[PDB]
Amino acid sequence: MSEVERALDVLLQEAEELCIGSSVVELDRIPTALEFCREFYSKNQPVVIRKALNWPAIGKWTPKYLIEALGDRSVDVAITPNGYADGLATQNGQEYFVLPLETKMKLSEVVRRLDDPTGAVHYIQKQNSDLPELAADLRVSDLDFAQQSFNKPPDAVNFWLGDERAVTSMHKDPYENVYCVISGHKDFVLIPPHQLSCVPRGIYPTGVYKTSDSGQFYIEPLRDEEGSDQFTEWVSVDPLSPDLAKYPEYARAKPLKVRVHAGDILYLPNYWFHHVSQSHKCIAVNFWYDLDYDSRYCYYRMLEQMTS
Amino acid sequence: MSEVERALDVLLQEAEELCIGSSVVELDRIPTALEFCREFYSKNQPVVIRKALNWPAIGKWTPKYLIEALGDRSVDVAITPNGYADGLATQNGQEYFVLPLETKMKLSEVVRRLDDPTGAVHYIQKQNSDLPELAADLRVSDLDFAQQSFNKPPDAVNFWLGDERAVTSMHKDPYENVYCVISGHKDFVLIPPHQLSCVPRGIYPTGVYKTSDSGQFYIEPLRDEEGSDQFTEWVSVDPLSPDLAKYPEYARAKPLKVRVHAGDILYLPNYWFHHVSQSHKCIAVNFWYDLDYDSRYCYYRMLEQMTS
Ligand SMILES: C[C@@H](NC(=O)C(=O)O)C(=O)O
Numbered sequence A, B: 001m002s003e004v005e006r007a008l009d010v011l012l013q014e015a016e017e018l019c020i021g022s023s024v025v026e027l028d029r030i031p032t033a034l035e036f037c038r039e040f041y042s043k044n045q046p047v048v049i050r051k052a053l054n055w056p057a058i059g060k061w062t063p064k065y066l067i068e069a070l071g072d073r074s075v076d077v078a079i080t081p082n083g084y085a086d087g088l089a090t091q092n093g094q095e096y097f098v099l100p101l102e103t104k105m106k107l108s109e110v111v112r113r114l115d116d117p118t119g120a121v122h123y124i125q126k127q128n129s130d131l132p133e134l135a136a137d138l139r140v141s142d143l144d145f146a147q148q149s150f151n152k153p154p155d156a157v158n159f160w161l162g163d164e165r166a167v168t169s170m171h172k173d174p175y176e177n178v179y180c181v182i183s184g185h186k187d188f189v190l191i192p193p194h195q196l197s198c199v200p201r202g203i204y205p206t207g208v209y210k211t212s213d214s215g216q217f218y219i220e221p222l223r224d225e226e227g228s229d230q231f232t233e234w235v236s237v238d239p240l241s242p243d244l245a246k247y248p249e250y251a252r253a254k255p256l257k258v259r260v261h262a263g264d265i266l267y268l269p270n271y272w273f274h275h276v277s278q279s280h281k282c283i284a285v286n287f288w289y290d291l292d293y294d295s296r297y298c299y300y301r302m303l304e305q306m307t308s
């Protein structure tokens, strides 16, 4: 055993005896700003709040209503064959990290495509900071309890509507994430940052899903300025069915499972690994806040260097 | 570099670029409980608040006022020949970590010995108390702005009165510390936990000061039932006259210096390295709160493994 491995082992033993990030706290009432800063944000600790929101949206937002209120606008939608946009797929003997086919279609067309169990996997992800009627269905002020710890306005606000086959593979974000399911449920698999050395990562060629004239889906590699291949580091394990023979270290990881229902709020702290499934035609909005750096971030950068 | 050295280099370079623990924040107005939680407790960041307290004690507490008010009670006093209780000292060619001689004597005797420059170094530490005449002169609720981040009662409340020659060598505490100078000033040299690799530690035999039949001070080694010598890991650097030839890594440290005056409050975050000096007959009261574990403690234990 090298010194790096004994360091990582001490880290893990200490976190296991202390059960750091060993569960997702569950609340029935929204906390106060002070409670949220002290108990969750300051400990980099996730929490789910049940039936927290009574926004109009939660009862009225569906595909049909959305087309109605949004004047059946054209949308930017993401399509894949396997349902793993930003995920791993093999082609011609080569494993790629593949981005979605991003095309434009009328909301109604999306709703027809989601209703086809045999078709491709579609989802809509829109980012910003008709939208006013949608905004009339929301009271963002109600998230003050969390926002006061971040002490800045959301750097992004995302709306999500898609197919149950759309699976978001395990990744980490540099954001505090306040996640509000509107219609349906989202299933999260969470892993704390300090378990980095238990989550196998590889370097993969970058590809994008593309349609042919015939209509069959294929992967096209990506190039840089010079024309050389672009690469992407990514988590190699599949939380839903992990290959522990190929990835023994993942045996030491301790994923947490949480289902977030309509009206619930999930706080996903920055740099937590998350893998997301969902229910068919689930609608959700989340709010991304740029993180404030402290020693934890420098420790995690050190951890990234120790996990070559 | 070795793998571990490169890891440490990343940690320090990140923290340097991001100004982590790079200064003591200075406030002229007391923060709200939420501001304190968000800016200092949760970042593990020191802050000093100037002229923050209006306690009646700030003004009148002196050894004289204390004798007249307390009625020349007998108290526990700590005595050393060198002014370094819990500090390194050599004897017969061996370096020891040495505990004060602890004795009982009357306040008027301590005041008399505090006026003997030729005498040994004396200081009173009282751990906890509720005295009619003196609990009336403070108002601990005034510290709630910080106590609410800790959400617990103090583990200990220390009263300190000592000689200018009484120097507290550099060490770390498992507590959040709210430090309140009542009279005089205290000088702190602070180093953030993540700079551990820059702070040399050694393992030293443990001793306690004793006086011989003729009045000479000497170091008595500490032993257990088995008769084996007891040992203590201790910081080997002296931040007042640091020997960078012996400890080159200490040049990569960035110690912060702060003077806490009568009425000032200093938040010393948990596990921060501190070294303390004081003006003559300085009086101070501090509140320790057990720390709340999260990943930073585990990273710190890993750092300890990496630097040994
Ligand atoms: C794609 C995914 N969201 C995130 O990964 C996130 O909000 O960070 C989802 O909710 O399906």
Ligand SMILES: C[C@@H](NC(=O)C(=O)O)C(=O)O
Residues within 6 Å of the ligand: B160, B168, B173, B177, B276, B277, B278, B284, B286
């Ligand atoms: C002994 C020292 N206090 C501490 O070391 C502390 O409060 O942690 C002092 O007040 O000089």
Ligand SMILES: [Mn+2]
Residues within 6 Å of the ligand: A171, A172, A173, A274
């Ligand atoms: Mn994400």
Ligand SMILES: [Mn+2]
Residues within 6 Å of the ligand: B171, B172, B173, B274
């Ligand atoms: Mn201390």
